[PDB]
Amino acid sequence: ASCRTPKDCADPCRKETGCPYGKCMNRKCKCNRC
């Protein structure tokens, strides 16, 4: 998934991992765990 600012990964990262830790690295959601 792609983003605009890294808070746009808070919705796909809260759906796929479950916590909203993800960076906007060249329009890609680099998601993490809590």
Long-range Cβ contact pairs of 3-12 (< 8 A, separation 24 or more):
3/27, 3/28, 3/29
- Return the percent helix, strand and coil in the chain, to nearest 5: 30, 20, 50
d(CA 34, CA 27): 22
- Domain residues of the chain, as ranges? 1-34
Q: Is residue 1 within 8 Å of 9, Cβ to Cβ?
A: yes
Between the alpha carbon of residue 16 and those of residues 2, 24, 28, 29, the distances in Å are 14, 16, 14, 11
Q: What CATH number was assigned to the domain covering residues 1-34?
A: 3.30.30
